[PDB]
Design a protein around this ligand. Structure first.
Ligand SMILES: [Cl-]
Ligand SMILES: [Cl-]
Ligand SMILES: [Cl-]
Lengths: 142, 81
């Protein structure tokens, strides 16, 4: 019933993460989500003493709501460009319904509770990306 | 003492990344009001209705109690993922 949580600048590879996530025979349904930066560079400011802890607390809550197997959550920091992979969420369960629902929940809570802030380097200077009301409403449904 | 950290726009407006305060405040809200009262820039940074707070690296209500040795953080709505 292990959990992998990683926060750092290094790139990740879905092909390297998938084999461990899907290894157990009892984990019969496997769901992954990858999010990419959506031309200006972005930089991700963060709260180091809290980012890993916040991600772990979201997965702990998911485990109390659904019967989950192995779980992996990775979030990058530093300078990134459109098309670069920024976040990975991998979840397993006995049935597809729980795996899909837990993946959605983990992303909705990550986007409203994990301490990361995007800044864009535009032609006129750095500008902070705006938080979205749609993310607040998505999180409130759980 | 209590250690207070700031991030993103909040950090930029208050003008420091971190500071220390004596443990003379019952709650996060009482501490927020004390810091807002230091200057017009500190009031603008800390009186926003969407401001978030953490105590010992967990998100909490502004009614959360404070204790000597705690780490408190104030920051705006998050934009990761
Ligand atoms: Cl998205
Ligand atoms: Cl969704
Ligand atoms: Cl006051």
């Amino acid at each position: 019933a292990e959990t992998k949580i990683v926060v750092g600048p290094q790139p990740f590879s879905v092909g390297e993460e998938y084999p461990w996530l899907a290894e157990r025979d009892e984990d019969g349904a496997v769901v992954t989500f990858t999010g990419k930066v959506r031309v200006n560079a972005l930089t991700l400011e963060h709260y180091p003493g809290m980012t890993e802890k916040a991600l772990a607390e979201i997965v702990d809550e998911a485990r109390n709501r659904w019967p989950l197997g192995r779980v992996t959550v990775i979030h990058r920091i530093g300078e990134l460009w459109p098309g670069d992979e920024i976040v990975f969420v991998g979840v397993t369960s006995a049935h597809r319904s729980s795996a899909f629902e837990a993946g959605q929940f983990i992303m909705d809570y990550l986007k409203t509770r994990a301490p990361f802030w995007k800044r864009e380097a535009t032609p006129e200077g750095d500008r902070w990306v705006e938080a979205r009301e749609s993310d607040q409403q998505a999180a409130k449904r759980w | 003492m209590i250690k207070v950290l700031f991030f993103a726009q909040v950090r930029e407006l208050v003008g420091t990344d971190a500071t220390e305060v004596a443990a003379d405040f019952p709650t996060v809200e009482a501490l927020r009001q004390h810091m807002a009262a230091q200057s017009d820039r500190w009031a603008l940074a800390l009186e926003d209705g969407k401001l978030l707070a953490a105590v010992n690296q967990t998100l909490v209500s502004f009614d959360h109690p404070l204790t000597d040795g705690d780490e408190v953080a104030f920051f705006p709505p998050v934009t990761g993922g």
